[PDB]
């Protein structure tokens, strides 16, 4: 399979901040067939990005996909309360579809 590696696995951030999330592929993802999903607690995954950079209708434009080949990036600007969730990438450039292990975007609490 194409192994997709999202790291780091957790990122601690504040509201208003920009988040960059990386997805790296063990092989080239054909035709940039890479999607991103947001999953809030208790909820089903929701599609944010497909074709690497395409945004479904009804997804806010602060979500942006970029990259190609083996190196893909989701950028979330102006983090809103709602955006603290787990984010997954997915390649479907081969018939055996695979997901990354997920990146948790969580609020940075002063310890």
């Amino acid at each position: 399979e194409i192994v997709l590696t999202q790291s780091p696995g957790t990122q601690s951030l504040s509201p208003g901040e920009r988040a960059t999330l990386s997805c790296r592929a063990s092989q080239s993802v054909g035709n940039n067939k890479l999607a991103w999903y947001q999953q809030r607690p208790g909820q089903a995954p929701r599609l944010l990005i497909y074709g690497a950079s395409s945004r479904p209708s009804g997804v806010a434009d602060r979500f942006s996909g970029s990259g190609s080949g083996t190196d893909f990036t989701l950028t979330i600007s102006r983090l809103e309360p709602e955006d603290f969730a787990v984010y997954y990438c997915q390649q479907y450039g081969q018939s055996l579809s695979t997901f990354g292990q997920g990146t948790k975007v969580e609020v940075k609490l002063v310890p």
Binding site: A44, L47, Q90, Q91, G100, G102
Partner: protein, 127 residues
């Protein structure tokens, strides 16, 4: 317009089988796929396989093929995931997700991206 609704949570003994259902409404009359995705507790997402109900074509992930059966009833736009012999490892939320077709026309290879999801079905293996 497209909505996917799954059958309710189930509790099952080890060695038993269970069948989870996913009913799709709305969308265009087309060769869409309904795929099944596993999420174990605290864990990530894994594609198990899928079916195109219009054409009775099924597609499995190799690591799941030996232990599951995926079918569809095309007249009710309902896809089914049977887990054939349950173990504790099989405790998970199972999601259905719909792959649409690409390009003009009702008839085409499903895209691999999942634009629509069911609410999930928790399967708990007791004992």
């Amino acid at each position: 317009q497209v909505q996917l609704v799954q059958s309710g949570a189930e509790v099952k003994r080890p060695g038993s089988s269970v069948t989870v259902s996913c009913k799709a409404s709305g969308g265009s009359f087309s060769t869409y796929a309904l795929s099944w995705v596993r999420q174990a507790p605290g864990r990530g997402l894994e594609w198990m396989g899928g079916v195109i109900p219009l054409l009775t074509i099924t597609n499995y992930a190799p690591r799941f093929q030996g232990r599951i059966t995926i079918t569809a009833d095309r007249s009710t736009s309902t896809a089914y995931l049977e887990l054939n012999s349950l173990r504790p490892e099989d405790t998970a939320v199972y999601y259905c997700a719909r792959e649409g077709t690409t390009g003009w026309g009702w008839l085409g290879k499903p895209i691999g991206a999942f634009a629509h999801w069911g609410q999930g079905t928790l399967v708990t293996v007791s004992s």
